[PDB]
Amino acid sequence: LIPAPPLSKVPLQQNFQDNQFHGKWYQVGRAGNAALREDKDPQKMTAQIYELKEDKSYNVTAVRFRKKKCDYLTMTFVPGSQPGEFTLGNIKSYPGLTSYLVRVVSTNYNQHAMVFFKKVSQNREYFSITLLGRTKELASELKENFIRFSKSLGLPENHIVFPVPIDQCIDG
Numbered sequence: 001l002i003p004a005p006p007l008s009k010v011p012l013q014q015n016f017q018d019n020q021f022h023g024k025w026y027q028v029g030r031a032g033n034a035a036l037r038e039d040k041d042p043q044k045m046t047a048q049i050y051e052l053k054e055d056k057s058y059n060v061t062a063v064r065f066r067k068k069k070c071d072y073l074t075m076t077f078v079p080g081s082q083p084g085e086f087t088l089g090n091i092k093s094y095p096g097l098t099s100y101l102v103r104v105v106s107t108n109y110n111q112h113a114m115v116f117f118k119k120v121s122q123n124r125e126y127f128s129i130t131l132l133g134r135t136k137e138l139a140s141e142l143k144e145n146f147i148r149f150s151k152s153l154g155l156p157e158n159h160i161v162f163p164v165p166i167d168q169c170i171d172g
């Protein structure tokens with residue numbers, strides 16, 4: 001594990017528009033401070049649906065292709081006073097999770113987004129950054145910008161992964 005960065009190093013998308021951020025996003029890139037993992041099984045891409053609710057929170061559902069079937073997980077992001085920042089609803093329901101924070105760093109809403117996550121699980125602090133795309137593939141310039149932002153946070157190139165687009169489940 002590499003140290004979580006001070007929030008002052010993590011920008012917040014100016015004038016965040018929650019109703020433009022809703023809908024389907026693909027995780028085209030991700031970088032975390034965690035385990036690094038050896039595996040001759042390539043990482044498959046996942047999709048996330050940000051469902052904006054009446055209480056202004058998002059029910060975020062991710063889906064992955066696993067054991068020949070589709071596997072879903074939904075988490076509720078509760079808005080803070082600063083637009084684009086969130087905390088986790090019903091944290092007691094997640095075994096081991098004691099702190100959780102979300103910050104939308106940047107997005108143009110119709111193509112891409114970069115989201116920062118910081119959490120404490122079983123007394124260890126983890127953080128990650130994801131590159132979301134409206135499509136499964138994004139321009140090399142957006143991926144390089146994501147790579148340099150991840151680096152700016154102290155993450156080495158080998159912690160950065162661009163999951164392989166697949167057809168199963170995520171075209172949901």
Ligand SMILES: O=C(O)CN(CC(=O)O)[C@H](Cc1ccc(NC(=S)NC(CO)(CO)CO)cc1)CN(CC(=O)O)[C@H]1CCCC[C@@H]1N(CC(=O)O)CC(=O)O
Nearest residue numbers: 027046047048060061062063064071072073074075117130
């Ligand atoms: O985020 C993705 O798109 C791929 N993720 C992996 C990754 O980031 O490397 C998982 C993928 C994922 C899919 C299905 C199951 N389903 C299970 S646990 N299902 C049973 C377990 O049997 C529990 O409900 C059964 O239903 C678990 C894992 C989904 N993640 C949760 C995770 O990483 O644990 C997302 C879940 C929805 C909220 C946003 C969240 N992450 C968004 C992000 O990283 O950009 C932030 C975060 O991870 O804190």
Ligand SMILES: [Y+3]
Nearest residue numbers: 027030062130
């Ligand atoms: Y995730």
